[PDB]
Subunit: 195 residues, 4 copies
Amino acid sequence: SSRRQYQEKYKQVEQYMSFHKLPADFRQKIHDYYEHRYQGKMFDEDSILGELNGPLREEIVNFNCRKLVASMPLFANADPNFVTAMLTKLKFEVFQPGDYIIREGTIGKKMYFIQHGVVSVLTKGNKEMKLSDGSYFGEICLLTRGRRTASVRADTYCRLYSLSVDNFNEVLEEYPMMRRAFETVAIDRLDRIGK
Amino acid sequence: SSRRQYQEKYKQVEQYMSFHKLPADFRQKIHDYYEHRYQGKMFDEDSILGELNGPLREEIVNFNCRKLVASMPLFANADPNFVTAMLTKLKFEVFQPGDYIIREGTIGKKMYFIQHGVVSVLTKGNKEMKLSDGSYFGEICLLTRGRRTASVRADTYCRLYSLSVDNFNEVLEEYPMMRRAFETVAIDRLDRIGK
Amino acid sequence: SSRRQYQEKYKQVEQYMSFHKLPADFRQKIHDYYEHRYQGKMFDEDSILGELNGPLREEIVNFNCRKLVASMPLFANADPNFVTAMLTKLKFEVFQPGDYIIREGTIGKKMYFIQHGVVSVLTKGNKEMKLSDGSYFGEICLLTRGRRTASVRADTYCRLYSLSVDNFNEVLEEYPMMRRAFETVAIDRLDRIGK
Amino acid sequence: SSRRQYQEKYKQVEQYMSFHKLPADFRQKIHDYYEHRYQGKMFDEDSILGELNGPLREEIVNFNCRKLVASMPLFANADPNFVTAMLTKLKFEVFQPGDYIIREGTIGKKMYFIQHGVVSVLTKGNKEMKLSDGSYFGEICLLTRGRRTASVRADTYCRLYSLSVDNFNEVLEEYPMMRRAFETVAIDRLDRIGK
Ligand SMILES: O=c1[nH]cnc2c1ncn2[C@@H]1O[C@@H]2COP(=O)(O)O[C@H]2[C@H]1O
Ligand SMILES: O=c1[nH]cnc2c1ncn2[C@@H]1O[C@@H]2COP(=O)(O)O[C@H]2[C@H]1O
Ligand SMILES: O=c1[nH]cnc2c1ncn2[C@@H]1O[C@@H]2COP(=O)(O)O[C@H]2[C@H]1O
Ligand SMILES: O=c1[nH]cnc2c1ncn2[C@@H]1O[C@@H]2COP(=O)(O)O[C@H]2[C@H]1O
């Protein structure tokens, strides 16, 4: 039944690609994205969660994110109520190899937690660094309100969870002691890239 | 026919739970919630009320809330036009036993009127107090813009009506004399919990 | 086909009324409203007009409102481009006999143009006055940002077009010379009701 | 299948026109618009692009707009990342011969890039000028926050891409060096029309 709803949606994407005469390799790339992102199933997730209440939604995001939470010290060792407030504002995103998730110099308005995948952190000239499952990136712009200090490129398929600057700020107003945890990491990174 | 629309919606929830591999007890808890919240029937309530006008919507909320109004002195003894302005901005919510409706220390942005159910008011150390049909809670944060002064936990299934801080403020701009009614109760409660 | 879409929508309203156990006279009142408001036909008007462009939407509202425009000196004698800017922001509303469209003392945020119907203007004590096809009301609050100076009650079924304070202000920023036309009428009315 | 979705949508437009008793020539004009705008096919484009990610959406708009980009020096010779930020915020619009896309004296909040078509630029008295594929108009109001300095009328069917003032400002905050490119053209035009 879910296999069916994904099928009808994907048919519309196919029609969109056909109308716009997208090339063959591009259509395959979009197909592969859809299979990785939705895994052959689709539901009106916003309508469903909207029909619930706060406690149920909170129990669901905690259950779904058990591995993300336990695998990242920032979350694992934090007040579970801070963790819940973060989890409720995360957006699942999938990226493909070679995607520029972040471009250096742009104005950043979201950060990313890596559930699964490897990314390259690229700066003018300081040797590529890598981040994987359990790490996060894009926090510096959220803290500074300035420009991205590096590009971040997917090496693999990446399952990420994003957090918008407005949501990051709302949570940190509620849990101001957690602001320093991010600030400490941002400062260490700014030092390491010397800029 | 309504029995039918609830059935199709609930099938989607079942599919969501299946995809996310939620445990058996959790799936039952979500089923029980849905039966209590929607009572086997569903309609596009927002579309319906949207097709009406102000007078009809006002007549409907007044009719539906006759018992809530008559059972709560704040409403029963107030200008019926204030009562209508409140009723039009209430959101029906259902909570299950053990749910933390409010957590102490968090930043509150809504209050609750109890149509039916019992809740426990819990503070660091002052002996649990109980609130039931005809009472309300969560007003203090709405008045102070500060942090919740207690946790409130459902003891029973609870049928509540919530009111957002923005809506509470809009109504009280129109009916500023009613602001003191809430302030008096908030002050009495802050005294009783000594903090 | 439109007769069909209205039928399916109205069935949902019937189900809503049944679920909430609304009284017989109330259900009839809602039926009569629906027949007067939609005249047995329904379409997704917002989706349709959304698919068009500015020029087509403007040509449509002008065509539909030819009688409203020609029957009201404020519009008939104005810059047709001001008239178009007003017409595009009007919302069709239907009221039934006895409805309080406006209540004295409330904070007003919309005004009304009467396409067809009769209303009574009611103030503490100054003798009921009547307004009909070609007139408008609710402008004073829009101009003053204060409280309604009278109640306005439908005597008949009324076909009205409303204009929100924000839309009224946006149009009058573009066409500031038209602000005085409304101000002159508001002042004359404030004089007549002496308050 | 897309031919089918356009057919069902157009039937609703036909029903809307019938209900409002629009004249024959007007109904034909709306039919011709729909054929030019949608070319007999329709999909939920917002839902589709919403299911993708940033990189895919960016690859799609770049592919679809290759000719617009290569045919306009402002884009062709710019940082491709600026171009992408512009392209992602463009809205496709179709206008018909004689449409007033912009009226002199009004408060402007969007500019237009011409993919295909010819427009006339009309001012009080300075001889009509023409703009075509590869040019843009409506930038001056975006820069000045004042009133339109000319009317712009479609001579032909026009395929345009619009950009809102808020989006224009957001992009130019990110790419402030591109602000001067528009300012230089605006100044040259203000000189030429002497006002
Ligand atoms: O030395 C580093 N080791 C690991 N990560 C790093 C390092 N330097 C930068 N980053 C990440 O790259 C992001 C680019 O966007 P941002 O400026 O908003 O935040 C940055 C950091 O999260
Ligand atoms: O002594 C009390 N008797 C009954 N209720 C109480 C008492 N103390 C607090 N409360 C309620 O608990 C809420 C917690 O959220 P809040 O801070 O926004 O508002 C509080 C009050 O409504
Ligand atoms: O003497 C009057 N003759 C006709 N109309 C009048 C007179 N007095 C008031 N009104 C209308 O009643 C409205 C009540 O809402 P409002 O205060 O926003 O604007 C008022 C006027 O439009
Ligand atoms: O001399 C001119 N040659 C070509 N175009 C011109 C000239 N003068 C004005 N325009 C365009 O007309 C628009 C009217 O709206 P706008 O004031 O926001 O921006 C204007 C310019 O883009």
